[PDB]
Design an enzyme around this catalytic site. Sequence first.
Site, PDB file in Angstrom:
ATOM      1  CG  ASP A   1      -2.227  -0.848   0.984  1.00 39.79           C
ATOM      2  OD1 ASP A   1      -2.353  -1.518  -0.070  1.00 39.79           O
ATOM      3  OD2 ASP A   1      -3.091  -0.866   1.896  1.00 39.79           O
ATOM      4  CB  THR A  22      -9.357   1.662   5.922  1.00 46.04           C
ATOM      5  OG1 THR A  22      -8.637   1.878   4.708  1.00 46.04           O
ATOM      6  CG2 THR A  22     -10.756   1.108   5.587  1.00 46.04           C
ATOM      7  CG  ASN A  48      -4.832   7.292   1.856  1.00 50.47           C
ATOM      8  OD1 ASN A  48      -3.805   6.891   2.431  1.00 50.47           O
ATOM      9  ND2 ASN A  48      -5.622   6.484   1.167  1.00 50.47           N
TER      10      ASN A  48
END
Lengths: 268, 275
Positions: free
Chosen positions: A51, A166, A125
């Site tokens: 990630d 998340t 994000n």
Amino acid sequence: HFKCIGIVGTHEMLYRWLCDQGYEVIVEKVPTGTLAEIGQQADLAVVVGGDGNMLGAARTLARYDINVIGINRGNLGFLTDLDPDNALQQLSDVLEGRYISEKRFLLEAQVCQQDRQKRISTAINEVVLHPGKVAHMIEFEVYIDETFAFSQRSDGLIISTPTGSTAYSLSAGGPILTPSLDAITLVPMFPHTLSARPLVINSSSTIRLRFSHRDLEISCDSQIALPIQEGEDVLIRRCDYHLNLIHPKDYSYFNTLSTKLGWSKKLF
Amino acid sequence: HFKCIGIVGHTTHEMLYRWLCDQGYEVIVEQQIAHELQLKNVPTGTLAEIGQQADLAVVVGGDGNMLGAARTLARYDINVIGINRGNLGFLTDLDPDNALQQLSDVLEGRYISEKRFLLEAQVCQQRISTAINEVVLHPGKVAHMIEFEVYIDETFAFSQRSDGLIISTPTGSTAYSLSAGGPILTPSLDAITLVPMFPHTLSARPLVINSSSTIRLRFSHDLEISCDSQIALPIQEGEDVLIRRCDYHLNLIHPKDYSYFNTLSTKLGWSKKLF
């Protein structure tokens, strides 16, 4: 089927198998390119390294008509599906056209002086409004679609995509948003008002943040902070392009979520 | 221009009836409330008849009365406006102390239309209810733990041990869901929220999914489903529960000066302009 594959970021093994299969390959001792050139030239980008660098890759690769798949380095990620031991087997299936798409939208954050754009960044994000020096309280007004919504005294504000929900947002008490939801979440950072709660709005909405006239910044995906000078405001909106993310056919988002967060996967 | 106006919801009712009749509208009153108010020479219909034939329904008595009315009225091509009990509501827009003036503007065509979707719950043996706010899975005995599996679009998601599960619409997100720690969803969002009720897993968090997604709940071989303020409905052993968006929506209308965020910030005590 795909014509040109980019390798961005097993690294030795991947190139060799793809060449043997007949594919044109472009890599970051041999056609080579910059990330943007690979975005431009390739139909599929394989990103190596979990990630972490997928995040950096994502912001550039989102600008192009290119599919993106990530090969993590052992452990599950939200953006990186391939385990190195099963990598070729799954990549083979994908190359035969057998894959799942999961478009991920991005946020654009502008620092504006009236109508003049002063600074701009993007985020897959989150965008975080915060003081220059931390834990000190700040005041701001939130406008949604140019209509005053509410004001807040807090340590700051997190504006997160579903992808970001998340991450930092989650650690600040935000809700989880499923990856392709057409929504943005606003998550306060330690608000003075005890009734403050995360707010989820349509991703087609714009957010304007205004500040007192008398050292604020925004950080997008923890990139270098953009200063907000006196008299300036922040505009946040959905980008007009998305990350074309792809997954193997046995991808289950909810399996990933439950596994990463330690949720029970028990059946009776 | 509305022609036929229904008055629904169980003193404000009488003022409305008389005023609307004075204005020359065809007015019809929901049957149960007419009898409950003990009214005389006032024409009545079933809530369904009103839904299928009237152009507008005026719901009296606040958010609570709107919930009951909305489950029938949503099924139909009827506009719906509500009068609050004095203090602001999320579903009722009109001030009862200024209802005649506000409604006059709406009747002249000054309003904004908004659709609110509902949830449908099915109890499956391989029975139905609907809800505008939320569907709550819980045991018959309060503060007792239950165990269940959750599937989303039929893919297994997670199991939970807890006091139950709240599945809320954006409309319901300011209601029970909010008290339970859920997020606030803007009323028009195409989303539903799953909010656990005291889960044993400390990393459990509210989850927000597309309103086009389905939710299936599976249990061990005293479980109940409560939709809005309706009586708890038993789930027999062997039965799964399936929850999805209804095929129909409530056609809510608002005064032109309606502001969701003003109502939200006023009701929750959030700060207003600073600078």
